[PDB]
Amino acid sequence: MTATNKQVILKDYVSGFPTESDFDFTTTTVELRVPEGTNSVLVKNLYLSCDPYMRIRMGKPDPSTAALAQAYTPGQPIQGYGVSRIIESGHPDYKKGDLLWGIVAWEEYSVITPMTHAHFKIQHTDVPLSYYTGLLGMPGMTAYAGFYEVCSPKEGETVYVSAASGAVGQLVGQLAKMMGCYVVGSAGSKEKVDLLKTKFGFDDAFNYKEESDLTAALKRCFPNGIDIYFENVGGKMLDAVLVNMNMHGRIAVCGMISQYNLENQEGVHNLSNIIYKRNRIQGFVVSDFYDKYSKFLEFVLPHIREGKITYVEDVADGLEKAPEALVGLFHGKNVGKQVVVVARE
Amino acid sequence: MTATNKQVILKDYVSGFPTESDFDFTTTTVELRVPEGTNSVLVKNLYLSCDPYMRIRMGKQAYTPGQPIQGYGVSRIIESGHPDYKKGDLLWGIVAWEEYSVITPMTHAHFKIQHTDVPLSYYTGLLGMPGMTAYAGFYEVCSPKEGETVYVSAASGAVGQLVGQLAKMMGCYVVGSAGSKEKVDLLKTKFGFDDAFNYKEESDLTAALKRCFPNGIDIYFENVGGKMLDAVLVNMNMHGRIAVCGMISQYNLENQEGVHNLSNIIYKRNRIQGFVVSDFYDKYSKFLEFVLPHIREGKITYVEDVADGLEKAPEALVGLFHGKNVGKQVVVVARE
Numbered sequence: 001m002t003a004t005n006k007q008v009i010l011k012d013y014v015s016g017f018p019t020e021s022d023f024d025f026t027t028t029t030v031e032l033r034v035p036e037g038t039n040s041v042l043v044k045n046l047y048l049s050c051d052p053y054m055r056i057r058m059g060k061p062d063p064s065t066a067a068l069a070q071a072y073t074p075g076q077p078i079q080g081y082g083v084s085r086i087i088e089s090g091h092p093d094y095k096k097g098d099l100l101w102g103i104v105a106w107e108e109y110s111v112i113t114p115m116t117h118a119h120f121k122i123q124h125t126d127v128p129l130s131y132y133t134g135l136l137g138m139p140g141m142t143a144y145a146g147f148y149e150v151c152s153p154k155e156g157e158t159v160y161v162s163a164a165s166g167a168v169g170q171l172v173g174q175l176a177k178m179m180g181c182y183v184v185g186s187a188g189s190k191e192k193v194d195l196l197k198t199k200f201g202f203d204d205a206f207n208y209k210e211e212s213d214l215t216a217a218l219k220r221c222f223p224n225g226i227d228i229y230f231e232n233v234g235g236k237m238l239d240a241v242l243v244n245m246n247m248h249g250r251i252a253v254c255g256m257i258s259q260y261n262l263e264n265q266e267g268v269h270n271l272s273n274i275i276y277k278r279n280r281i282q283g284f285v286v287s288d289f290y291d292k293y294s295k296f297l298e299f300v301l302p303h304i305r306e307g308k309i310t311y312v313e314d315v316a317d318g319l320e321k322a323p324e325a326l327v328g329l330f331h332g333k334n335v336g337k338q339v340v341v342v343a344r345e
Numbered sequence: 346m347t348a349t350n351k352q353v354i355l356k357d358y359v360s361g362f363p364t365e366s367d368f369d370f371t372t373t374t375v376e377l378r379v380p381e382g383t384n385s386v387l388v389k390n391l392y393l394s395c396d397p398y399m400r401i402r403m404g405k406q407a408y409t410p411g412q413p414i415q416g417y418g419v420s421r422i423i424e425s426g427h428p429d430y431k432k433g434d435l436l437w438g439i440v441a442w443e444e445y446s447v448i449t450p451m452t453h454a455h456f457k458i459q460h461t462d463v464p465l466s467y468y469t470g471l472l473g474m475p476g477m478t479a480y481a482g483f484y485e486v487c488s489p490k491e492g493e494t495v496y497v498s499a500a501s502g503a504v505g506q507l508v509g510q511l512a513k514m515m516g517c518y519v520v521g522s523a524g525s526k527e528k529v530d531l532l533k534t535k536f537g538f539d540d541a542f543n544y545k546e547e548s549d550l551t552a553a554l555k556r557c558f559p560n561g562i563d564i565y566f567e568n569v570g571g572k573m574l575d576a577v578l579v580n581m582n583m584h585g586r587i588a589v590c591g592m593i594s595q596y597n598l599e600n601q602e603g604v605h606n607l608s609n610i611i612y613k614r615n616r617i618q619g620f621v622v623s624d625f626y627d628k629y630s631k632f633l634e635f636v637l638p639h640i641r642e643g644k645i646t647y648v649e650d651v652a653d654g655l656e657k658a659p660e661a662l663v664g665l666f667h668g669k670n671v672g673k674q675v676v677v678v679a680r681e
């Protein structure tokens with residue numbers, strides 16, 4: 001049997017921002033039986049993610065960026081994290097009808113090899129299959145091992161979270177409230193800042209966009225200053241944190257989404273302050289910690305199921321809407337994690 | 346005895362680079378008495394240190410202008426009221442920039458010299474507060490393994506020169522930069538750094554590091570900032586540490602420059618950890634007992650530039666920010 005397999009292709013390399021135009025559409029004919037090779041499986045991608053790593057995987061091969069996760073080949077389908085179901089297998093741990101999450105291409109049917117810190121088993125289908133592109137996935141694992149491991153948190157301390165009503169950020173601020181920390185958020189709209197103050201249980205929050213003096217916002221919110229900072233923004237925002245940070249204060253550099261879309265990268269001036277304040281700027285990728293994903297799930301699935309972690313998503317229908325759904329993420333049109341549903345169950 | 350005390354004042358605060366004309370000489374008369382009050386000693390300042398933190402203290406910590414400049418130095422006790430010191434033994438710590446001073450010892454500001462079988466100007470530098478920076482910042486905050494590669498900026502001087510000696514003792518590959526070909530030559534001649542360049546001869550600073558490191562940079566010891574950190578962040582390796590000691594590029598400025606390449610920290614999984622030496626003084630008696638076997642042996646060396654008297658001590662602190670100092674800028678106030 002042959003399958004009518006629609007795909008989303010990248011045209012060529014990005015300079016600046018993404019547009020629906022830097023992407024294109026094709027169809028192929030992938031047959032519904034076995035792959036022979038290494039330890040190969042043909043899946044059917046049901047859900048897919050729009051994660052921001054994808055910008056500096058959409059750009060021209062720089063040695064800096066190409067030491068994270070490589071570069072997209074022009075005119076071949078966009079790789080990304082997303083939930084998938086086995087049609088036919090050539091692996092032992094995966095049998096016909098099993099589910100996985102991992103790095104699949106933006107196509108309806110993918111021909112992947114499973115390796116251990118890339119593709120992961122779904123043993124738990126007691127809770128949304130969509131969430132393995134988020135909370136029970138890689139955005140949620142960033143937030144576990146990132147906040148607990150490199151922010152090195154200790155109770156009562158004051159946390160700042162930027163890009164806080166979105167997948168990694170909304171989880172950090174919850175995992176922080178669960179230590180009885182003072183968490184303040186920052187997000188782009190009022191819709192976004194209201195969820196921070198209600199649903200996600202942060203103590204205060206602002207809209208950075210509607211804030212003139214970058215620094216003065218963080219001075220009002222934190223009278224006593226900041227101890228932890230979960231960095232999802234950069235530039236203008238890190239300069240604001242370094243005059244507002246307390247002594248032996250830590251910074252976890254998760255991302256820097258303001259920069260990704262720039263060719264001419266913004267200046268961070270106030271780095272002088274980390275001698276004066278004995279501060280720790282620490283960067284990480286999730287991939288280094290995917291060995292403790294067994295140890296993540298054992299914690300989070302007790303806590304979601306009991307009403308201690310909350311999570312919103314931004315679901316769009318089909319591959320057709322997946323250009324649209326990766327573009328306005330860089331402009332912030334997503335309210336929480338941007339999922340794009342290729343097929344449901 | 347009732348001798349005169351020549352002193353170096355600060356007139357008014359500094360806004361840019363320090364000129365010799367923001368400092369002037371005045372004189373008091375000190376009675377070489379069993380002294381003032383609280384847990385006091387009267388001291389004679391033998392040697393003084395021209396340290397680059399002093400520009401931040403010339404800002405609006407902070408110095409009180411019309412009074413002396415405070416800094417580190419080696420001094421002999423003249424008369425005591427502290428239970429530890431007696432007449433004729435040796436202290437290092439925060440003295441004032443005069444001939445004779447009345448400081449009260451606080452244990453981790455001021456420290457007693459026992460080993461006098463070493464050049465004593467070395468206790469302003471190698472065995473002082475630049476030396477404890479180079480032990481603490483390299484062994485703890487740079488977190489080193491063997492074979493791993495170190496870049497040291499302002500390698501010439503004080504901190505930077507013991508860092509690169511302690512790395513090719515661990516078994517690392519060490520590179521350093523300096524601003525003249527006298528200071529670059531010193532790195533291969535005296536201290537035996539694997540490679541070295543002149544950063545002033547590089548228009549091409551990101552390429553300069555690509556050249557010196559085929560392997561990449563695992564460890565940086567940051568003494569400088571700005572453009573040099575922007576260049577080292579391109580050049581880093583995976584799970585690469587940067588130990589932020591100083592920023593002499595920035596101290597000097599009423600501008601204070603921007604570092605554009607901090608996105609590299611997610612990708613190359615970097616630790617930029619800033620420290621203060623004062624926090625590590627509990628580990629001074631462990632440092633002192635490690636390095637003095639090796640200094641005595643001739644294995645750890647040091648280059649100093651010495652200025653003679655309080656006269657040529659503005660000329661010495663001004664000149665530090667340009668880099669007229671070939672190594673550590675010490676001032677001798679008194680000969681033995």
Ligand SMILES: NC(=O)c1ccc[n+]([C@@H]2O[C@H](COP(=O)([O-])OP(=O)(O)OC[C@H]3O[C@@H](n4cnc5c(N)ncnc54)[C@H](OP(=O)(O)O)[C@@H]3O)[C@@H](O)[C@H]2O)c1
Nearest residue numbers: 052053166167168187188254255256257258285286330332
């Ligand atoms: N370290 C890792 O390995 C790893 C893993 C996953 C994610 N990340 C990183 O962390 C960040 C995002 O978290 P996420 O994946 O959960 O996505 P997300 O937070 O769901 O969505 C991205 C957010 O981007 C914000 N934004 C867009 N342009 C902005 C700008 N110019 N300035 C400030 N904010 C802007 C938007 O907020 P607003 O609407 O609030 O402006 C939007 O909600 C990214 O930088 C990403 O690369 C890193």
Ligand SMILES: NC(=O)c1ccc[n+]([C@@H]2O[C@H](COP(=O)([O-])OP(=O)(O)OC[C@H]3O[C@@H](n4cnc5c(N)ncnc54)[C@H](OP(=O)(O)O)[C@@H]3O)[C@@H](O)[C@H]2O)c1
Nearest residue numbers: 398499502503504505523524590591592593621622666668
């Ligand atoms: N606990 C701490 O964190 C702590 C403690 C002690 C010292 N420190 C810091 O570390 C530094 C002091 O010792 P050191 O090893 O640097 O040697 P130094 O000999 O005391 O300092 C002078 C050197 O500064 C360099 N320099 C001056 N202006 C510069 C500029 N415009 N751009 C780039 N480089 C410039 C020059 O070298 P070149 O021209 O040869 O490069 C010069 O030889 C200071 O930044 C100081 O504040 C920090």
